[PDB]
Design a protein around this ligand. Sequence first.
Ligand SMILES: CCC[C@H]1C(=O)CC(=O)O[C@@H]1CC(=O)/C(C)=C/C[C@@H]1O[C@](C)(CCO)C[C@@H]1C
Ligand SMILES: CCC[C@H]1C(=O)CC(=O)O[C@@H]1CC(=O)/C(C)=C/C[C@@H]1O[C@](C)(CCO)C[C@@H]1C
Lengths: 121, 121
Amino acid sequence: SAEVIDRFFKSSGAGDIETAVECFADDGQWITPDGDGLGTVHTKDQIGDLITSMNAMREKMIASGVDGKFESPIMFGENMGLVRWTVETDDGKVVNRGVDLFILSDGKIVLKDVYRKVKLA
Amino acid sequence: SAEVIDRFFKSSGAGDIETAVECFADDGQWITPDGDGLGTVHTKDQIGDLITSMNAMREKMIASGVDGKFESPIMFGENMGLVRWTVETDDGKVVNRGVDLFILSDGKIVLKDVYRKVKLA
Ligand SMILES: CCC[C@H]1C(=O)CC(=O)O[C@@H]1CC(=O)/C(C)=C/C[C@@H]1O[C@](C)(CCO)C[C@@H]1C
Ligand SMILES: CCC[C@H]1C(=O)CC(=O)O[C@@H]1CC(=O)/C(C)=C/C[C@@H]1O[C@](C)(CCO)C[C@@H]1C
């Protein structure tokens, strides 16, 4: 149903850390888009701290005039959802875009694998 | 059948540019992982030049001691394939990883959307 993706975004975005963490399978992973070129793997016991830190910085970004915008998930496998996102200014200038790949099993997130397009130089 | 993904990799990898280009729908797009943080969109009439340039640099990389390694596609929609890849050294040290998202329609590639994990600093 992909309802767990909506649950994850609603809770994480509102700072309801505990609900957001519980959207993940006990063996699930959230892999960040950076991590020295390899991505940083966070297991379920590390995801609460990641959400807290990311929300703190989203707050700073918003105050700086930039925020993220997420599209509704495009479902492929019934078990796979692609959430496209942008970072953009108030007047809609897109400065970064990327994707969240969600792999689901049994109503829980087994993988959230995040990628961004790269700014070089 | 995702056979067009295999056709694309075989032809592109062998420098059979024309076959590789014809794997794409006439409205298909290949979006690179970089492009100033937004990805660079290449339409079908631009894909041949991209393959030629990428193969030239793959050759230089190989001579420098690094090459790409691609996994078989994980199919989700029957119309969607995720090809994971790494850049690694001869002795298997992984220095970069990323994904190719293939969207297929009617036996042709409508989107090849490429992402890499980001090395920061
Ligand atoms: C300033 C660095 C840019 C972003 C990062 O690279 C991670 C980080 O630390 O700061 C930023 C984070 C950022 O741009 C947004 C807009 C995050 C959105 C929020 O993220 C949650 C936790 C869900 C996952 O996206 C809830 C909400 C959607
Ligand atoms: C040195 C920069 C690193 C790579 C880029 O960021 C694009 C570029 O110019 O050089 C490199 C390219 C690279 O690392 C490999 C290994 C490409 C593989 C080949 O690419 C083809 C065209 C299919 C698409 O992958 C066929 C073959 C699989």
